Ligand binder design. Structure first.
Ligand SMILES: *[C@@H]1O[C@H](CO)[C@@H](O)[C@H](O)[C@H]1NC(C)=O
Ligand SMILES: *[C@@H]1O[C@H](CO)[C@@H](O)[C@H](O)[C@H]1NC(C)=O
Lengths: 50, 39
């Protein structure tokens, strides 16, 4: 990790993250209030009363 | 993307032929005897 002294750790993917993402990518996902609206199976959530 | 009936799941990975959705692709291929596999 010596690219001439350039600090590339904030954009290279973190092996500790299970999604293989970086700090800035995680911040970009956290900064958008994304609604899935049916990306996964959720008819069981619909039939359950709330 | 739901549940798929009729296509056999395999542990390998090739190029996408029929895109199921959410990272699954199916193709018609020989087992070793020809069937529809998903990967
Ligand atoms: C790169 O920057 C991070 C953030 O401060 C730091 O933890 C890390 O030690 C730095 N790496 C190098 C090689 O300078
Ligand atoms: C879908 O089914 C699996 C097992 O068949 C179960 O573990 C999971 O909780 C179910 N999810 C929903 C949203 O019903």
């Amino acid at each position: 990790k010596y690219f001439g002294g350039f600090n590339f750790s904030q954009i290279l993917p973190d092996p500790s993250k299970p999604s293989k993402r970086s700090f800035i990518e995680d911040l970009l996902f956290n900064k958008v209030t994304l609604a899935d609206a049916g990306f996964i199976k959720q008819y069981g959530d619909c039939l359950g009363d709330i | 993307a739901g549940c798929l009936i009729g296509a056999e799941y395999v542990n390998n990975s090739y190029e996408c032929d029929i895109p199921i959705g959410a990272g699954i692709c199916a193709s018609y291929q020989t087992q070793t005897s020809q069937s529809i596999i998903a990967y």
